[PDB]
Paper text:
The purified TtEst2 enzyme has been crystallized and the structures have been determined of both the native enzyme and its complexes with three different reaction products.
The TtEst2 enzyme reveals an open substrate binding site, which is solvent accessible due to the absence of the usual ‘cap’ domain which is present in TtEst.
Residue numbers in the entry: 1 to 172, 176 to 283
Amino acid sequence: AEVGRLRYPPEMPGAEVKVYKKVDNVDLKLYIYKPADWKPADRRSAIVFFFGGGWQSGSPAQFRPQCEYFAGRGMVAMAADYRVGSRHNVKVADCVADAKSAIRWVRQHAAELGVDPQKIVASGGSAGGHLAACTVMVPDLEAPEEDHTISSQANAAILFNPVLILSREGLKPRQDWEERLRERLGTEPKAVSPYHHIRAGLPPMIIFHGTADNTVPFETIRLFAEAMKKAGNRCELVPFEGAAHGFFNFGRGDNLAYQKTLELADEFLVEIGFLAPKGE
Ligand SMILES: [Cl-]
Ligand SMILES: [Cl-]
């Protein structure tokens, strides 16, 4: 509900604004937070957050607090806008293209951003967590007007109650439901279903999910994580006992889950060599 009251477009005080994509006569922006000691020539890790809201609504403001945290730790942290149903009459596949365009843009512009182009983390909540996962493991579905010699693939992901299974193929593949998914998603459902793209050799990830989630059942995420681990990938699943969809957000449950998810995300980033340990 609180997340639902966020402003669009957001103020994002202290952020630098860059347009990463011009599409359908809208300028899609990144809201960029740099560390206090940032200099051109830096080669910092970066994180790009994609807001939640069912691919229908939401605001980059959702992840402003996390951006401020990670910029405090020395990352170039940013929150991306992307097209949504209520504002732009797009479908899920369009959202995925925008998320991929954002990672591509950060990589293309890594030098001027003071960023290491092989340390770009994709992150998000719910629908935005789906997008982040798509940037790590789903093939590009379109080639927009952008540098396709530059990869859209993120180097790691941090997912907050993501949607990871968008097709029922290979679960316990009924036709009419997959056809309804096709019309909603703008493509074959498997083409935007991270679970259907599990293979060896993928970037590392951490996932935070409530065990009492009625929106995205925890069991879908357990299945995902088990299969990823079977494929040899680093896929850390942190259950939040009794928590529901949206539990991790700044401003709810006394900020306890907010703080805990940041702590664990920080250690994950140290583990994979994207952040220096807090001990310096
Ligand atoms: Cl790895
Ligand atoms: Cl829920």
